[PDB]
Amino acid sequence: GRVKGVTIVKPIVYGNVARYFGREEDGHTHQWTVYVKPYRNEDMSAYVKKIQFKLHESYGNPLRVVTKPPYEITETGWGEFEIIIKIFFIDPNERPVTLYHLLKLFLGKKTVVSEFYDEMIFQDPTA
């Protein structure tokens, strides 16, 4: 399935925020949120069906799925690992997009933001 029409570029931003010292219950050191958003705000539900965040196996249930904005997963942990972000489209002939993001957690400052720009190339109907 491959389109026969106009091409659409929708820029996006993906990555995580994390805040430190946040332990007795479970030894965890950080809260973090991993996310995908549009570069400029828009209702990304117009074309995104759902976004999967595949976590490290140390998480119970490493497969996380979000279907409505904001496309984010918040968690606590002790470690950095690579997260696979897979974006699925409403249109069944627009193939999914797979992103990879190294979760960053960590000396005086408490918060970290690791954020990348990308672009989804959809193809639109040729109205």
């Binding site: 490290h56 196996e57 002790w78 470690g79 950095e80 690992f81 690579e82 960590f106």
Partner: peptide, 6 residues
């Protein structure tokens, strides 16, 4: 896979 603390 790899997951590493500070």
């Amino acid at each position: 896979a790899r997951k590493s603390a500070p």
